[PDB]
Design an enzyme around this catalytic site. Structure first.
Site, PDB file in Angstrom:
ATOM      1  N   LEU A   1       0.834  -1.140   0.240  1.00 18.71           N
ATOM      2  CA  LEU A   1       0.208  -0.131   0.149  1.00 18.71           C
ATOM      3  C   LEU A   1       0.754   1.163  -0.082  1.00 18.71           C
ATOM      4  O   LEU A   1       0.632   2.193  -0.707  1.00 18.71           O
ATOM      5  CB  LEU A   1      -0.889  -0.103   1.312  1.00 18.71           C
ATOM      6  CG  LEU A   1      -2.085  -0.780   1.050  1.00 18.71           C
ATOM      7  CD1 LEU A   1      -3.226  -0.489   2.204  1.00 18.71           C
ATOM      8  CD2 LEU A   1      -2.846  -0.641  -0.510  1.00 18.71           C
TER       9      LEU A   1
ATOM     10  N   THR B   1       6.597   0.468   6.541  1.00 19.20           N
ATOM     11  CA  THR B   1       5.746  -0.292   5.186  1.00 19.20           C
ATOM     12  C   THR B   1       4.523  -0.618   5.739  1.00 19.20           C
ATOM     13  O   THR B   1       4.289  -1.224   6.903  1.00 19.20           O
ATOM     14  CB  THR B   1       6.538  -1.398   4.487  1.00 19.20           C
ATOM     15  OG1 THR B   1       7.804  -0.979   4.461  1.00 19.20           O
ATOM     16  CG2 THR B   1       5.928  -1.854   3.203  1.00 19.20           C
TER      17      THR B   1
ATOM     18  N   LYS C   1       1.469  -3.955   8.868  1.00 18.63           N
ATOM     19  CA  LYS C   1       2.444  -2.766   9.161  1.00 18.63           C
ATOM     20  C   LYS C   1       3.601  -3.403   9.571  1.00 18.63           C
ATOM     21  O   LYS C   1       3.691  -3.707  10.718  1.00 18.63           O
ATOM     22  CB  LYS C   1       1.912  -1.659  10.008  1.00 18.63           C
ATOM     23  CG  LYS C   1       2.782  -0.229   9.842  1.00 18.63           C
ATOM     24  CD  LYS C   1       3.223   0.238  10.932  1.00 18.63           C
ATOM     25  CE  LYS C   1       2.094   0.673  12.080  1.00 18.63           C
ATOM     26  NZ  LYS C   1       2.535   1.570  13.171  1.00 18.63           N
TER      27      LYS C   1
ATOM     28  N   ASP D   1      -2.217  12.937  18.079  1.00 12.57           N
ATOM     29  CA  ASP D   1      -1.783  13.125  16.682  1.00 12.57           C
ATOM     30  C   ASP D   1      -3.032  13.024  15.789  1.00 12.57           C
ATOM     31  O   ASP D   1      -3.004  12.461  14.764  1.00 12.57           O
ATOM     32  CB  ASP D   1      -0.864  12.079  16.218  1.00 12.57           C
ATOM     33  CG  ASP D   1      -0.001  12.293  15.007  1.00 12.57           C
ATOM     34  OD1 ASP D   1      -0.265  13.480  14.428  1.00 12.57           O
ATOM     35  OD2 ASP D   1       0.659  11.642  14.452  1.00 12.57           O
TER      36      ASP D   1
ATOM     37  N   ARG E   1      -4.531  13.033   8.056  1.00 13.97           N
ATOM     38  CA  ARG E   1      -3.738  12.120   7.499  1.00 13.97           C
ATOM     39  C   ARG E   1      -4.002  10.702   8.155  1.00 13.97           C
ATOM     40  O   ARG E   1      -3.887   9.590   7.735  1.00 13.97           O
ATOM     41  CB  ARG E   1      -2.406  12.339   7.440  1.00 13.97           C
ATOM     42  CG  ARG E   1      -1.606  12.613   8.914  1.00 13.97           C
ATOM     43  CD  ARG E   1      -0.492  12.878   8.751  1.00 13.97           C
ATOM     44  NE  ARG E   1      -0.073  13.323  10.198  1.00 13.97           N
ATOM     45  CZ  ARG E   1      -0.020  14.611  10.599  1.00 13.97           C
ATOM     46  NH1 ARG E   1      -0.355  15.627   9.928  1.00 13.97           N
ATOM     47  NH2 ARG E   1       0.322  14.949  12.002  1.00 13.97           N
ATOM     48  N   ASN E   2      -4.430  10.958   9.423  1.00 11.16           N
ATOM     49  CA  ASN E   2      -4.633   9.727  10.487  1.00 11.16           C
ATOM     50  C   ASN E   2      -6.124   9.371  10.726  1.00 11.16           C
ATOM     51  O   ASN E   2      -6.349   8.621  11.552  1.00 11.16           O
ATOM     52  CB  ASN E   2      -4.054  10.170  11.865  1.00 11.16           C
ATOM     53  CG  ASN E   2      -2.472  10.270  11.868  1.00 11.16           C
ATOM     54  OD1 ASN E   2      -1.917   9.758  10.657  1.00 11.16           O
ATOM     55  ND2 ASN E   2      -1.902  11.157  12.512  1.00 11.16           N
TER      56      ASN E   2
ATOM     57  N   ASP F   1      -3.713   5.339  13.958  1.00 11.18           N
ATOM     58  CA  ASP F   1      -2.547   6.099  14.250  1.00 11.18           C
ATOM     59  C   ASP F   1      -2.470   6.477  15.828  1.00 11.18           C
ATOM     60  O   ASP F   1      -2.364   7.616  15.905  1.00 11.18           O
ATOM     61  CB  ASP F   1      -1.982   7.176  13.424  1.00 11.18           C
ATOM     62  CG  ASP F   1      -0.512   7.179  13.072  1.00 11.18           C
ATOM     63  OD1 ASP F   1       0.395   6.738  13.979  1.00 11.18           O
ATOM     64  OD2 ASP F   1      -0.361   7.344  11.777  1.00 11.18           O
TER      65      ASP F   1
HETATM   66  C1  LIG Z   1      -2.854   9.109   4.213  1.00  7.75           C
HETATM   67  C2  LIG Z   1      -2.287   8.002   4.171  1.00  7.75           C
HETATM   68  C3  LIG Z   1      -2.633   6.536   4.041  1.00  7.75           C
HETATM   69  O1  LIG Z   1      -3.116   5.989   4.740  1.00  7.75           O
HETATM   70  N1  LIG Z   1      -3.106   6.189   2.554  1.00  7.75           N
HETATM   71  C4  LIG Z   1      -3.692   4.848   2.068  1.00  7.75           C
HETATM   72  C5  LIG Z   1      -4.457   4.070   3.176  1.00  7.75           C
HETATM   73  C6  LIG Z   1      -5.111   2.900   2.536  1.00  7.75           C
HETATM   74  N2  LIG Z   1      -5.885   2.187   3.680  1.00  7.75           N
HETATM   75  C7  LIG Z   1      -5.500   1.652   4.927  1.00  7.75           C
HETATM   76  N3  LIG Z   1      -6.177   0.697   5.362  1.00  7.75           N
HETATM   77  C8  LIG Z   1      -5.630   0.278   6.490  1.00  7.75           C
HETATM   78  C9  LIG Z   1      -4.684   0.879   7.224  1.00  7.75           C
HETATM   79  C10 LIG Z   1      -3.898   1.865   6.721  1.00  7.75           C
HETATM   80  N4  LIG Z   1      -3.137   2.622   7.266  1.00  7.75           N
HETATM   81  C11 LIG Z   1      -2.373   3.651   6.789  1.00  7.75           C
HETATM   82  C12 LIG Z   1      -1.669   4.180   7.696  1.00  7.75           C
HETATM   83  C13 LIG Z   1      -0.804   5.406   7.467  1.00  7.75           C
HETATM   84  N5  LIG Z   1      -1.078   6.676   8.447  1.00  7.75           N
HETATM   85  C14 LIG Z   1      -0.781   7.588   7.716  1.00  7.75           C
HETATM   86  C15 LIG Z   1      -2.552   6.689   8.260  1.00  7.75           C
HETATM   87  C16 LIG Z   1      -1.682   3.443   8.926  1.00  7.75           C
HETATM   88  C17 LIG Z   1      -0.992   3.420  10.286  1.00  7.75           C
HETATM   89  C18 LIG Z   1      -1.614   3.076  11.152  1.00  7.75           C
HETATM   90  C19 LIG Z   1      -0.965   3.071  12.451  1.00  7.75           C
HETATM   91  C20 LIG Z   1       0.369   3.626  12.688  1.00  7.75           C
HETATM   92  C21 LIG Z   1       1.118   4.231  11.533  1.00  7.75           C
HETATM   93  C22 LIG Z   1       0.283   3.915  10.049  1.00  7.75           C
HETATM   94  N6  LIG Z   1      -2.524   2.519   8.451  1.00  7.75           N
HETATM   95  N7  LIG Z   1      -4.514   2.474   5.378  1.00  7.75           N
HETATM   96  C23 LIG Z   1      -4.983   2.447   1.239  1.00  7.75           C
HETATM   97  O2  LIG Z   1      -5.514   1.258   0.856  1.00  7.75           O
HETATM   98  C24 LIG Z   1      -6.537   1.553  -0.116  1.00  7.75           C
HETATM   99  C25 LIG Z   1      -4.159   3.303   0.595  1.00  7.75           C
HETATM  100  C26 LIG Z   1      -3.859   4.449   0.833  1.00  7.75           C
HETATM  101  N8  LIG Z   1      -2.862   5.244  -0.216  1.00  7.75           N
HETATM  102  C27 LIG Z   1      -3.261   5.184  -1.469  1.00  7.75           C
HETATM  103  C28 LIG Z   1      -2.930   6.440  -2.322  1.00  7.75           C
HETATM  104  O3  LIG Z   1      -1.411   6.582  -2.322  1.00  7.75           O
HETATM  105  C29 LIG Z   1      -0.864   6.458  -0.883  1.00  7.75           C
HETATM  106  C30 LIG Z   1      -1.523   5.401  -0.245  1.00  7.75           C
END
Ligand SMILES: *CCC(=O)Nc1cc(Nc2nccc(-n3cc(CN(C)C)c(-c4ccccc4)n3)n2)c(OC)cc1N1CCOCC1
Length: 290
Positions: free
Chosen positions: A23, A28, A48, A135, A139-140, A153
């Site tokens: 993703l 990562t 993650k 936080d 974005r979160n 997050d």
């Molecule tokens: C804004 C950044 C983002 O999250 N883009 C994103 C999210 C998802 N779906 C998703 N599903 C489950 C869990 C997550 N996720 C993302 C993140 C990153 N933070 C910034 C929100 C985390 C996280 C959790 C705890 C601690 C640290 C990080 N969990 N995201 C996507 O699936 C479809 C796709 C995307 N983006 C698509 C466009 O290009 C960037 C990635």
């Protein structure tokens, strides 16, 4: 006396995951399927994936395993492989900051105000569980469907006992946090106000082009984020109330729920937007209860 945290920490086998694509990296975040042993279900998940950073990710898993609310992301489990992996529900529409940016021309007032309701509901739940997020930002906030968002997050989240002191996101923090490193639920309310401003401006950067070292002096002189174009004074005044110097005279999350709920009942009295008006055994995580 604090209550005993009887949350369960699910340890998941590595063979239960059929991790697919990546993703996004930074760590990562992967996407994939989770198939519990012989349960006949396929759950879409995000994963993650070396040093004492393991302590932090487990502090994150502790918080995420101890929350249960429709507008908060919960930990499905951890996998103790070479690296410690956090397994969470796949939020297929991404984060809300990217979502409002990529879809500005198709977001109506009802969606913006509903998101403000749901984020306030999630934050009010965290306050009920004595959790300071520290936080909160667009974005979160993750998007399960355009009608359903959840907060995620918790890497900075702390459990208040029966103000917390302490790298931090300066342009989202209350002044008392920037100055005194003091964090409460009411400093979260400040971050909520910046997050609403993010949504109301369809993903603008707060204090764009202003070094973070200048934020403390700017906020002290009385300056705040500008009124977004689509915002009536009603909505902007809510955001300004989140940015008061006196933390106790800021709105409580339970009040922001009420206020935005009334506005979401007549969304165009308050937001002026031009244009307004495989598979088979797949089960969403919200429907897999154990
Ligand atoms: C804004 C950044 C983002 O999250 N883009 C994103 C999210 C998802 N779906 C998703 N599903 C489950 C869990 C997550 N996720 C993302 C993140 C990153 N933070 C910034 C929100 C985390 C996280 C959790 C705890 C601690 C640290 C990080 N969990 N995201 C996507 O699936 C479809 C796709 C995307 N983006 C698509 C466009 O290009 C960037 C990635």
């Amino acid at each position: 006396g604090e209550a005993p945290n009887q949350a369960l920490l699910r340890i998941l086998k590595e063979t239960e995951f059929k991790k697919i694509k990546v993703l996004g990296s930074g760590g990562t975040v992967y996407k994939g399927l989770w198939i519990p042993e012989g349960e006949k279900v396929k759950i879409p998940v995000a994963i993650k994936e070396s040093p004492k950073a393991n302590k932090e990710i487990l502090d994150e898993a502790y918080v995420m395993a101890s929350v249960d609310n429709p507008h908060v992301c919960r930990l499905l489990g951890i996998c103790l492989t070479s690296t410690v992996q956090l397994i969470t529900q796949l939020m297929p529409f991404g984060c809300l900051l990217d979502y409002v940016r990529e879809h500005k021309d198709n977001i109506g007032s009802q969606y913006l105000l509903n998101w403000c309701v749901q984020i306030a509901k999630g934050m009010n739940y965290l306050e009920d569980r004595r959790l300071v997020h520290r936080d909160l930002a667009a974005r979160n906030v993750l998007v399960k469907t355009p009608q359903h968002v959840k907060i995620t997050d918790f890497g900075l989240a702390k459990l208040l006992g029966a103000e917390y002191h302490a790298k931090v996101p300066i342009k989202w923090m209350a002044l008392e946090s920037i100055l005194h490193r003091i964090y409460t639920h009411q400093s979260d309310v400040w971050s909520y106000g910046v997050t609403v401003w993010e949504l109301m401006t369809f993903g603008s950067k707060p204090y764009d082009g202003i070094p973070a070292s200048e934020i403390s002096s700017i906020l002290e002189k009385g300056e705040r984020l500008p009124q977004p174009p689509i915002c009536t004074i009603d909505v902007y005044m809510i955001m300004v109330k989140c940015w008061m110097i006196d933390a106790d005279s800021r709105p409580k999350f339970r009040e922001l729920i009420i206020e935005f709920s009334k506005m979401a009942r007549d969304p165009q009295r308050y937001l002026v937007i031009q244009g307004d008006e495989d598979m088979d055994d797949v089960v969403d995580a919200d429907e897999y209860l154990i």
